Structure 1
Amino acid sequence: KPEDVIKEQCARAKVVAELWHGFTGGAPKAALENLVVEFNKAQQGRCVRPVPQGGYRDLSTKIKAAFAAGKVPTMAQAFENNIALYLEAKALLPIESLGVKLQGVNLTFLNAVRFGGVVYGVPFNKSIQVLYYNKDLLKKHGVPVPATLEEFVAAAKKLSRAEGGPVYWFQPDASTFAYFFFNLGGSYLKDGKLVLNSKEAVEALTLLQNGVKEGWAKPITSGYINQNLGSGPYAFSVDTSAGYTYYLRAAKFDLGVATLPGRTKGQPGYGLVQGTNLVVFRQASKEEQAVAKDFLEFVLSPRAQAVFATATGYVPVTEGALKDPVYQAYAAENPDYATIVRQSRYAKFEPALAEWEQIRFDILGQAIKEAILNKADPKAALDRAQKLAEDLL
């Protein structure tokens, strides 16, 4: 068990840098621990201790408690909005002040960790949405993988009619809504104001709610989409690439990965970038900061990124990772890794506002759930979301 190995490594160590994370298990937790085990073996008496804090929401709550208690870890995973929050307290070390080189990091990811021109995060486990699909079920009914939103809706209705059940499965949540919202031309910031109830928002939430009414979209209310597989016909989901190993272990059918359907065939749709960056807390000792420096250099190395990305379905964050022989050997055997990289070229972020975590779950996610599960009118549900968000900001 890698967490037992690390516990023993850290027991023999003169300096331990704690890294608080939101991996509850599967391949992401095993890949993070395996990376830490190798880092720790290369050091002389210096270690990283990964500390599971629950999911990402539990992690952000535990960091809030840590600020209140006046005792932060050395490193933590952080979404771009969590970075914005922690910078209000000036709790974060600039990454380049540690002497970590970021050249060769993808500008999609590096730009998202740059605040006021300075980098306060190291992109580590960055995901993109992809189209997961049931190759067997599409083959059975001769339905090509849809390249456009129009094709996707047609494919879902045709397969749902043939199978007697809704085949597009989705979580009624902010992540899923972002795919439809972005690819209907939606934009969350209008002259720097956060807008949740634009016509593209209403259109995105109407399309999902109509999908449920018309019997081609199946809301998943309990667990992850990959935990629900096997109950009723499944053709498609739009989901994080970090879901890849979880789909593979659950799927009784031949799992497919495609680029996202876009407005036209001239370009794939935009996917939502999720997963986290590593931040380094100012409060850490110079000795713990020096361990963070080396760990970050290690996490950005082409081998570390190649192994982590091939073990998980996360997007390798560097140019050098794609040139690493381990990455190349996996990609040559499994086209899904190249599909994830291609889709990572067409990448949108949610707003990096300090309040965004509360807004995306408690306000926006609640409005999506009202409309999908309680048949609330999409505009009325999003107008309420807008009022609650305007009150919070």
Structure 2
Amino acid sequence: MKPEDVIKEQCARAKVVAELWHGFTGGAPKAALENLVVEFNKAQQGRCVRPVPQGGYRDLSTKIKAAFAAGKVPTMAQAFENNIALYLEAKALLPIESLGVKLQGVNLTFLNAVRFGGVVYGVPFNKSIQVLYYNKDLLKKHGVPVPATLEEFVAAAKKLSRAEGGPVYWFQPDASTFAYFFFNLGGSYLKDGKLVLNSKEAVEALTLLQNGVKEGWAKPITSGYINQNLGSGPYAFSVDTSAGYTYYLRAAKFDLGVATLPGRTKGQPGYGLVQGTNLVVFRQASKEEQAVAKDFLEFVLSPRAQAVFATATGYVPVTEGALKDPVYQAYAAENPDYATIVRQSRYAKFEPALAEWEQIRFDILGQAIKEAILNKADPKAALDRAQKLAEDLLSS
């Protein structure tokens, strides 16, 4: 008997069912979402939220587009900020303050990102930040301090790769990893409102990663998550989502560390990319389904729900009230990694909120990064190609 089974029974006895389409495939994120929905459904009479896994986030956005063409949308779904911009073109989303959900106390980093034309269209729910994961044992073995600067981080990667005979900074050749280096070399994606993928800082960021591969300190991870590759070869560092935390803990045969990101100087951590999702509410939903969603959104923003979800997963608590919750404070008192995730969350940058950004980040930018890293494409050539494909897509 698992939470998916409890929910099936809850929804069988409900007159009103609000479907919540998500991209959690398993692990602690899926279990923590199901536990929240079980607790919510217990407090209802004749109403329930039914979580529906749609595969990953890419599959979820595909399924939502198909659902619009079919006229069969769920009540709620997870959405990135760019997915919100796309659904607003279709006038598909209900303004959250029209349901009367109170948003006071939501982190303005997250709430500003869901505001379009001054109107809030999503509820931050599962919001992640990049952190520096590291191998405490391996850095201890060689007396290497946790690097606080990008210059320190490259030096440490070089030193430890030479010592252990293989590349110890592991990375996915993807848009998320590129964003870390790009933003911390002073990059910006929007130049006077135009999307630019081929700026000098983009070229510098991709060149830094390609050079790290060539110099023997950076290891491209081509199959699976970094946490699914641990155990083969020496590992010192990765720059990866906070929502990876439980996956790294389950996989690591070494003592896992979590640090803030290396920055240009010791005066501030590096910026991390904010990922994970908001909850949106579809206009097509019934008034009765929308009233379940209102309740469910006030519940997800409650300090206890945030405290339990964040401590279960490594997601960033999205409210001030969550950090004052005793369950959150008890976990943080025993495990400094929670406070590290919160500190890092203060130094946060977003990708562009363009309707076309999901296609661009994977199929255009992500492909240019893979060409340069995996096929030794010249960085500037690869990003020049990415710029022209993005401009053609944005024109079309």
State the TM-score, normalized to the length of structure 2. 0.99
Q: Measure, in 2, the Cα distance between the counterparts of 1:369 and 1:55.
A: 21
Q: Measure, in 2, the Cα distance between the counterparts of 1:269 and 1:256.
A: 17
Tell me the percent identity. 100
- Deviation of 1:88 after TM superposition, in Å, equals 0.2
Could you say what secondary structure the match of 2:37 adopts? helix
- Deviation of 1:378 after TM superposition, in Å, equals 0.1
Q: Measure, in 2, the Cα distance between the counterparts of 1:36 and 1:221.
A: 35
Q: Please give the per-residue CA displacement for 1:42-83, whole angstroms capped at 9, x wherever unaligned.
A: 011110000000000000000010011011000000000000
Q: Please give the per-residue CA displacement for 1:137-178, whole angstroms capped at 9, x wherever unaligned.
A: 000000000000000000000000000000000000000000
Residues 1:127 and 2:116 are matched in the alignment: no
Could you say what secondary structure the match of 1:237 adopts? strand
Q: Measure, in 2, the Cα distance between the counterparts of 1:335 and 1:275.
A: 22
- Deviation of 1:384 after TM superposition, in Å, equals 0.1
Q: Measure, in 2, the Cα distance between the counterparts of 1:328 and 1:16.
A: 34
Q: Measure, in 2, the Cα distance between the counterparts of 1:45 and 1:341.
A: 38
Q: Measure, in 2, the Cα distance between the counterparts of 1:161 and 1:376.
A: 26
Could you say what secondary structure the match of 1:210 adopts? helix
Aligned to 2:108: 107
Could you say what secondary structure the match of 2:72 adopts? coil
Q: Measure, in 2, the Cα distance between the counterparts of 1:194 and 1:308.
A: 35
Q: Please give the per-residue CA displacement for 1:109-132, whole angstroms capped at 9, x wherever unaligned.
A: 000000000000000000000000
Q: Measure, in 2, the Cα distance between the counterparts of 1:5 and 1:253.
A: 36
Q: Measure, in 1, the Cα distance between the counterparts of 2:363 and 2:39.
A: 39
Q: Measure, in 2, the Cα distance between the counterparts of 1:81 and 1:71.
A: 21
Could you say what secondary structure the match of 2:166 adopts? coil
Q: Measure, in 2, the Cα distance between the counterparts of 1:114 and 1:60.
A: 20
- Deviation of 1:187 after TM superposition, in Å, equals 0.2
- Deviation of 1:221 after TM superposition, in Å, equals 0.2
- Deviation of 1:366 after TM superposition, in Å, equals 0.1
- Deviation of 1:387 after TM superposition, in Å, equals 0.2
Q: Measure, in 2, the Cα distance between the counterparts of 1:62 and 1:7.
A: 22
Q: Please give the per-residue CA displacement for 1:217-260, whole angstroms capped at 9, x wherever unaligned.
A: 00000000000000000000000000000000000000000000
Aligned to 1:92: 93
Aligned to 1:10: 11
Could you say what secondary structure the match of 1:239 adopts? strand
Q: Measure, in 2, the Cα distance between the counterparts of 1:363 and 1:217.
A: 23
Residues 1:214 and 2:215 are matched in the alignment: yes
4+ residue runs of structure 1 moved beyond 2 angstroms?
A: none
Structure 2, gaps ≥5 residues long: none
Could you say what secondary structure the match of 2:167 adopts? coil
Q: Measure, in 1, the Cα distance between the counterparts of 2:306 and 2:115.
A: 21
Q: Please give the per-residue CA displacement for 1:301-352, whole angstroms capped at 9, x wherever unaligned.
A: 0000000000000000000000000000000000000000000000000000
User: C-alpha root-mean-square deviation of aligned residues, in Å?
Assistant: 0.2
Aligned to 2:320: 319
Q: Please give the per-residue CA displacement for 1:241-291, whole angstroms capped at 9, x wherever unaligned.
A: 000000000000000000000000000000000000000000000000000
Q: Please give the per-residue CA displacement for 1:21-44, whole angstroms capped at 9, x wherever unaligned.
A: 000000000000000000000011
Q: Measure, in 2, the Cα distance between the counterparts of 1:265 and 1:328.
A: 27
Q: Measure, in 1, the Cα distance between the counterparts of 2:142 and 2:223.
A: 29
Could you say what secondary structure the match of 2:353 adopts? coil
Q: Please give the per-residue CA displacement for 1:95-119, whole angstroms capped at 9, x wherever unaligned.
A: 0000000000000000000000000
Aligned to 2:371: 370
Could you say what secondary structure the match of 2:305 adopts? helix
Q: Measure, in 2, the Cα distance between the counterparts of 1:302 and 1:290.
A: 21
Q: Measure, in 2, the Cα distance between the counterparts of 1:70 and 1:315.
A: 34
Q: Measure, in 2, the Cα distance between the counterparts of 1:240 and 1:45.
A: 38
Q: Measure, in 2, the Cα distance between the counterparts of 1:309 and 1:14.
A: 31
Q: Please give the per-residue CA displacement for 1:360-392, whole angstroms capped at 9, x wherever unaligned.
A: 000000000000000000000000000000000
Q: Measure, in 1, the Cα distance between the counterparts of 2:287 and 2:71.
A: 17
Q: Measure, in 2, the Cα distance between the counterparts of 1:46 and 1:259.
A: 42
Q: Measure, in 1, the Cα distance between the counterparts of 2:28 and 2:69.
A: 32
What is the correspondence of 1:229-240 to structure 2 with a 5 Å cutoff?
A: 229-240=230-241
Q: Measure, in 2, the Cα distance between the counterparts of 1:134 and 1:8.
A: 44
Q: Measure, in 2, the Cα distance between the counterparts of 1:229 and 1:4.
A: 33
Could you say what secondary structure the match of 2:318 adopts? coil
Aligned length: 393
Q: Please give the per-residue CA displacement for 1:200-229, whole angstroms capped at 9, x wherever unaligned.
A: 000000000000000000000000000000
Q: Measure, in 1, the Cα distance between the counterparts of 2:26 and 2:83.
A: 22
Could you say what secondary structure the match of 2:128 adopts? strand
